[PDB]
Write a protein that binds this ligand. Structure first.
Ligand SMILES: NC(=O)c1cn([C@@H]2O[C@H](CO)[C@@H](O)[C@H]2O)c2ncnc(N)c12
Ligand SMILES: [K+]
Length: 540
């Protein structure tokens, strides 16, 4: 046992768990100290006054507007209804009826205890007629839309005039603070990327755990990849999906550019396939993972963006067992009506169209989904052996010519979804046609997978990683780069560095404050709902 291997993980595991100060800096209350509201006049001018952004999408602003609504009983009742419609939207599909009636009898009646007077009588009656017809979780959608149409009016304008929006401006003043290497503390390397290495890092003030994808400036230049780096960053930010790694920071360094990403302490799937017992795992695990991978691919294809690099090592597991797609550097956004043409990908996972320099759309991803489902069931790549040292020229040859081979491990449904997703003609490939992912979601393979409860987070993952385990190779077994030489950086690269490095992302940052309880603890106003001194303009 090598000491460096041991110490590297015992440290990571200690920070991961916690536990005094929750892992925060000793002076975190001074770092995140609110400015005086008099310091937020610039923000006052530039902030866009949007109800949906300031009172729902922006996490801290959604809680500050609810705190304002709960200051007046006339507005709190609405917040109660909306919260009640949320429960009904995630309650048992059989108990919908009784709970839908509870809401109807609690909020939408002439003398209901918490009567909402802006929903509209026709609407409640329409909703009350459909109550019987059949109970669906979308039943109350319109009622809540009527509440939001009323809250975006006078209530929103009064919030903007309140001390709670002043507090939001303070929070935003903190959000926009600069990011730097001193903002985080780096831990062990979790894996090696294309331009650098992924590490585990921790925000020093909040204690939140992340993963830093370092992209070494010299390496980006040596390999002409300045557009791949920017594309990955812009992509990660544009996308929103519970099944794709999300971006929270993006800062620059003397020698590298960094992407702070969601940490996946469960590890990558290649590790769970080859370094944890027998090759491959059970179909049930493969079912769940393939389903979420598909969901993540549906979220990407909504923005007409292809991935082109689907392989086990780019699928990760989180604290609970759900997965996300990780290296979006090879992804591109095809023109909504045009197709692309580039031989990009990892051998054994490049689809036939991408192998003959043909032109393709969002197609090579469904080939990659089949390559995965096969590898998770069998224990090898469909067209290559585990440790076969086959020249990749031949690996190509096989995928276009030979046909994959199945075994007793594959079920009838598992063998079909693979054989349809591995169709060597894009037109005739499952999902590559017209319906889209919906043709996959019906396949006999997923005959027991409710992609609705899956996309909602109701299904429990099959495998749950153990907190006191590092589902990763040892640090000394991670491959290393070869020192770059002769690529001395200059000025013309400074324009791309400034465009890449945009600081913190708004919504992730605010979530980080909520989760770490920094918001909870520092978002204190005065006694009996009085102006605190940092919001009082009569004196600092
Ligand atoms: N999203 C990423 O870029 C990540 C890459 N790795 C590791 O780094 C390796 C790079 O291929 C993977 O196999 C993982 O072990 C990660 N490990 C944890 N969280 C992450 N967000 C990543
Ligand atoms: K295994």
């Amino acid at each position: 046992m090598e000491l460096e291997n041991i110490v590297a993980n015992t440290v990571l595991l200690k920070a991961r768990e916690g536990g005094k100060r929750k892992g925060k800096s000793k002076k975190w209350k001074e770092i995140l100290k609110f400015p005086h509201i008099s310091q937020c006049e610039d923000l006052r001018r530039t902030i866009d006054r949007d109800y949906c952004s300031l009172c729902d999408k922006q996490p801290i602003g959604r809680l500050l507007f609810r705190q304002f609504c709960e200051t007046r009983p006339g507005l709190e009742c609405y917040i109660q209804f909306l919260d009640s419609v949320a429960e009904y939207e995630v309650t048992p599909d059989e108990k919908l009826g009784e709970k839908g009636k509870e809401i109807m009898t609690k909020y939408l009646t002439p003398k209901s205890p918490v009567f909402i007077a802006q929903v509209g009588q026709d609407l409640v009656s329409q909703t009350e007629e459909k109550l019987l017809q059949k109970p669906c979780k979308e039943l109350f959608s319109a009622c809540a839309q009527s509440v939001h149409e009323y809250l975006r009016g006078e209530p929103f304008h009064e919030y903007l005039d309140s001390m709670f929006f002043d507090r939001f401006l303070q929070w935003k003043w903190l959000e926009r603070q600069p990011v730097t290497k001193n903002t985080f503390r780096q831990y062990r390397v979790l894996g090696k990327g294309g331009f650098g290495e992924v590490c585990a890092c921790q925000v020093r003030a909040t204690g939140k755990m992340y993963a830093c994808k370092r992209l070494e400036k010299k390496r980006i230049k040596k390999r002409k990849g300045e557009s791949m780096a920017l594309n990955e960053k812009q992509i990660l930010e544009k996308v929103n999906s519970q099944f794709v790694v999300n971006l929270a920071y993006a800062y620059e360094t003397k020698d590298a550019l960094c992407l702070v990403l969601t940490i996946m302490n469960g590890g990558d799937l290649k590790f769970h396939i080859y370094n944890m017992g027998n090759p491959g795992f059970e179909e049930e695990r493969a079912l769940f993972y393939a389903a979420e991978i598909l969901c993540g691919l549906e979220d990407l294809h909504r923005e007409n963006t292809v991935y082109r690099d689907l392989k086990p090592e780019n699928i990760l597991l989180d604290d609970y067992g759900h997965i996300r797609i990780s290296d979006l550097g090879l992804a591109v956004k095809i023109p909504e009506g045009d197709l692309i043409r580039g031989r990009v990908g990892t051998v054994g996972y490049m689809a036939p169209e991408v192998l003959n320099n043909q032109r393709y759309g969002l197609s090579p991803d469904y080939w990659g989904l089949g390559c995965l489902i096969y590898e998770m069931i069998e224990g090898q790549s469909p067209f290559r052996g585990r440790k076969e040292k086959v020249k990749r020229e031949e690996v190509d040859r096989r995928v276009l010519e030979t046909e994959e081979v199945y075994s007793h491990k594959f079920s009838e449904e598992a063998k079909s979804i693979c054989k349809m997703l591995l169709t060597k003609d894009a037109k005739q490939r499952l999902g590559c046609q017209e319906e889209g992912a919906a043709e996959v979601k019906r396949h006999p393979f997923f005959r027991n997978m409710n992609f609705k409860r899956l996309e909602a987070g109701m299904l429990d993952p099959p495998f749950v990683p153990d907190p006191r385990a590092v589902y990763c190779k040892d640090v000394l077994d991670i491959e290393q780069f070869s020192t770059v030489k002769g690529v001395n950086l200059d000025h013309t690269d400074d324009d791309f560095y400034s465009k890449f490095s945009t600081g913190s992302v708004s919504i992730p940052w605010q979530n980080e404050m909520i989760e770490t309880e920094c918001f909870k603890e520092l978002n204190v106003f005065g006694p009996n709902g009085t102006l605190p001194p940092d919001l009082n303009r009569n004196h600092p």
